[PDB]
A and B are shown apart, each in its own frame.
Chain A
Amino acid sequence: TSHRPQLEARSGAKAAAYTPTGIEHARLLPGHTTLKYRK
């Protein structure tokens, strides 16, 4: 066996109860910090 399909996907319910880490990612750096509003 050991090579299977998925019966269900990994839910985000599980990662919500974890404690966060606060590692700093390169793509979460501040960029496009100003919103543009329509007329």
Chain B
Amino acid sequence: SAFVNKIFQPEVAEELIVNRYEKLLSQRPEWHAPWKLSRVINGHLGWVRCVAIDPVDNEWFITGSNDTTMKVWDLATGKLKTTLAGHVMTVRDVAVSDRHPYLFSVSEDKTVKCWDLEKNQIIRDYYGHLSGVRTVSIHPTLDLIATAGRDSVIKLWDMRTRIPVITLVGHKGPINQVQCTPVDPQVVSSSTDATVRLWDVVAGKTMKVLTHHKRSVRATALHPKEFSVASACTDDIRSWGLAEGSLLTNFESEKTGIINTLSINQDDVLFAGGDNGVLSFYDYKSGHKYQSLATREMVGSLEGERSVLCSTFDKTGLRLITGEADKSIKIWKQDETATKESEPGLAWNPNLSAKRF
């Protein structure tokens, strides 16, 4: 209060451990309705490693997998539409274009492929990664696909001419996740050297390096509104303000260990898939873990198989498609007829002992 400022006379009056803590108790998080399992889909011969939703009209999603084949699943009924084979090794990331009928998919077989979704064939193969390619993001409005992998550089691919146009060299380890934003910084990347880079693609250099995580930043996710990115190390999840490189918030992720995937809803629901199945939903603007679920594997499988590997919401934001190690695709529904009363979620309780805030 004012007695803190008049006796322990500060120089900032915000950089005190108490004044930060009392404003956290001063504010309440937005309530969100919890999430429940609604459909389990068993269709792959291996792990599901990446899920992409149809960005236009939301009919279907596609799950690239460990059995080297992508399968197209209908969202509503859950039925299997078609199977897209054409890699020889494990498909790591799949991303669909919104302006194009094009599907880009990168495996660990060092190949970046495009797919004519009017024809369901492989067209326009890309070439040049020295090692397995982890991730792809289609740049919005610019006609570039950003691919990155164990190579440790991001190669900016022109679509039409298949040219490694811009190579982004800043990292020290394998890049786990890459994102594309419409303005500068146009490429957001995260690697195993515990850094998150903000790339000025014209100059080819880094605008800002975010060295706040301890261990390999395994997953990032862009917020569909409000222009921010949220990156996950093994212990902590930090939302980042783009165009300043500012640390917006630290989430209340404690004792979660290894966060494999992230996805942000329009309704400020951040999903954090853990390798220990323990899947958690965080308020985005605050950082409150308001729900923490655990999954059931199958009739028979190992205990390690309980692990979420990849996740995204649909276009409406009311469905959550997660792919797990137990060869399953789990659809998570946010249940209706839940109110702030009788479903409060976990209690908003920040502490001093964790230095997170």
Any B CB within 8 A of the CB of A12: yes
Q: Given A27-B127, A35-B143: A9 and B101 within 8 A (CB)?
A: no
Contact B153 A35 (CB under 8 A): no
Contact B125 A12 (CB under 8 A): no
Contact A12 B101 (CB under 8 A): no
Q: Which of A1-39 contact B (CB under 8 A)?
A: 9-13, 15-16, 25, 27-28, 30-38
In the bound complex, what is the Cα–Cα distance between A33 and B161 (angstroms)?
7
Among A16, A27, A28, A38, max chain B CB count under 10 A is at A38
Contact A37 B99 (CB under 8 A): yes
Chain B residues with a Cβ closer than 8 Å to the other chain, count: 29
Contact A13 B153 (CB under 8 A): yes
Any A CB within 8 A of the CB of B268: no
Neighbouring A residues of B127 by C-beta, 8 Å: 25, 27-28
In the bound complex, what is the Cα–Cα distance between A36 and B114 (angstroms)?
12
Could you count the A-B residue pairs with CB atoms below 8 Å apart for me: how many are there? Answer: 57
Contact B131 A38 (CB under 8 A): no
- Of all chain B residues, which has the CB nearest A33? B160
Contact B150 A9 (CB under 8 A): yes
Contact A9 B131 (CB under 8 A): yes
Contact A38 B153 (CB under 8 A): no
Neighbouring A residues of B97 by C-beta, 8 Å: 38
Instruction: Looking at the assembled complex, report how far the CB atom of B95 sits from the nearest CB atom of chain A, in whole angstroms.
Output: 15
Instruction: Choose one: B125, B153, B162; the contact of A11 (CB below 8 Å).
Output: B153
In the bound complex, what is the Cα–Cα distance between A15 and B123 (angstroms)?
27
Any A CB within 8 A of the CB of B167: yes
Q: Given A36-B101, A38-B99: A16 and B153 within 8 A (CB)?
A: yes
Instruction: Choose one: B100, B152, B162; the contact of A28 (CB below 8 Å).
Output: B162
- Of all chain B residues, which has the CB nearest A12? B153
Q: Given A16-B167, A35-B159, A36-B118: A9 and B130 within 8 A (CB)?
A: yes
Q: Which of B294-353 contact A (CB under 8 A)?
A: none
Contact B98 A12 (CB under 8 A): no
In the bound complex, what is the Cα–Cα distance between A11 and B131 (angstroms)?
9
Contact A35 B130 (CB under 8 A): no
Residues on A facing B (Cβ under 8 Å): 9-13, 15-16, 25, 27-28, 30-38
25 A-B residue pairs with Cβ-Cβ distance under 8 Å, sorted by A, are A9-B150, A9-B151, A9-B152, A9-B174, A10-B130, A11-B153, A12-B129, A12-B152, A12-B155, A13-B153, A15-B130, A16-B153, A16-B167, A27-B127, A28-B162, A31-B124, A32-B160, A35-B100, A35-B143, A36-B102, A36-B116, A36-B118, A37-B100, A38-B100, A38-B101
Residues on B facing A (Cβ under 8 Å): 56, 97-102, 116, 118, 123-125, 127, 129-131, 143, 150-153, 155, 159-162, 167, 169, 174
Q: Which 3 A-B pairs have the closest CB atoms?
A: A12-B153, A12-B151, A9-B150
